[PDB]
Amino acid sequence: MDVVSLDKPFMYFEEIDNELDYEKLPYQGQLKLLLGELFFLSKLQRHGILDGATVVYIGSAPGTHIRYLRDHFYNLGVIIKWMLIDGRHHDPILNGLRDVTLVTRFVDEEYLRSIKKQLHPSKIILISDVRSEPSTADLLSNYALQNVMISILNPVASSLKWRCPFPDQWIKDFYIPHGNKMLQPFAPSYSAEMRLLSIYTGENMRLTRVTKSDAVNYEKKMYYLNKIVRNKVVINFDYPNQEYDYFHMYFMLRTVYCNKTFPTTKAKILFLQQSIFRFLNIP
Numbered sequence: 001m002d003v004v005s006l007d008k009p010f011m012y013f014e015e016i017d018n019e020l021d022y023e024k025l026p027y028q029g030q031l032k033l034l035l036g037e038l039f040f041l042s043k044l045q046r047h048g049i050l051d052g053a054t055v056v057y058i059g060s061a062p063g064t065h066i067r068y069l070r071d072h073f074y075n076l077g078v079i080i081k082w083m084l085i086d087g088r089h090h091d092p093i094l095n096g097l098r099d100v101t102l103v104t105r106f107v108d109e110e111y112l113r114s115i116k117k118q119l120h121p122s123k124i125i126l127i128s129d130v131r132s133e134p135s136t137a138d139l140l141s142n143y144a145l146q147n148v149m150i151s152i153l154n155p156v157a158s159s160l161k162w163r164c165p166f167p168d169q170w171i172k173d174f175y176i177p178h179g180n181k182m183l184q185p186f187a188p189s190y191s192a193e194m195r196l197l198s199i200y201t202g203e204n205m206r207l208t209r210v211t212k213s214d215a216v217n218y219e220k221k222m223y224y225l226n227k228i229v230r231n232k233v234v235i236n237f238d239y240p241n242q243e244y245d246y247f248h249m250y251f252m253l254r255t256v257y258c259n260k261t262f263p264t265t266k267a268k269i270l271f272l273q274q275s276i277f278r279f280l281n282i283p
């Protein structure tokens with residue numbers, strides 16, 4: 001790989017500063033979700049709005065990684081209820097947890113109102129990973145449902161699956177919530193998917209229009225990220241693995257809270273990475 005010297009990785013989509021014409025690890029998908037959701041919830045923990053909240057995770061099955069998330073915050077003493085909702089059955093490793101409710105159901109508008117009624121007036125934190133290859137109509141339906149999740153559940157914060165339709169498959173302009181577009185380490189080699197992280201103030205979710213020219217910008221920026229940036233070795237990075245994804249993961253993991261104290265920040269991240277990899281059965 002090509003060597004590079006970096007002070008920090010690209011954490012959000014806006015930071016990608018170049019574009020390029022578009023042209024491995026075991027169970028990487030669970031690792032990708034685990035890192036992004038740890039980053040999202042740890043950010044909420046820093047703001048002091050995670051404690052006392054109920055995390056409603058829609059599209060959570062199989063959700064093997066969710067067991068690690070729950071244990072992590074449980075071992076920190078953070079008071080969270082988990083509500084996992086999916087039409088498919090969850091990983092059995094989530095069984096036997098009293099603070100985790102497993103719901104076997106595909107959510108629609110009517111059901112979203114019911115769960116809001118039972119959880120109200122408690123704080124709701126929304127995580128959506130629903131997916132129905134997917135067509136642009138499938139994505140538009142998914143993003144429409146995620147908008148309905150926010151307008152009905154009215155969460156204090158949300159993490160939403162966000163991948164813009166390809167410009168050569170455009171149908172119509174559509175609307176998505178305001179938020180920060182978190183980039184995902186250990187995503188598929190050429191995935192353009194990101195997570196939309198939103199914290200709602202005055203609970204007025206302002207919607208932004210997405211256009212075909214936005215789709216072109218997403219495609220070219222993400223291809224540059226996947227083809228060039230993620231194939232670099234960060235030679236100044238002090239870590240056993242200097243590949244960009246580990247450099248990217250390192251910066252996400254240093255937002256995580258830990259009960260254990262460590263002599264150095266590197267030791268903490270190394271411990272966290274070993275812990276996450278061991279649970280997910282990654283060498």
Ligand SMILES: Nc1ncnc2c1ncn2[C@@H]1O[C@H](C[C@@H](N)CC[C@H](N)C(=O)O)[C@@H](O)[C@H]1O
Pocket residue numbers: 033058059060061062063064065066085086087088105106107108129130131132145
């Ligand atoms: N309307 C819906 N309500 C709930 N779950 C849905 C809906 N549409 C699709 N899904 C689920 O979304 C899931 C998509 C998965 N890629 C999610 C993986 C999951 N987040 C994991 O941690 O392993 C599937 O299990 C679908 O059953």
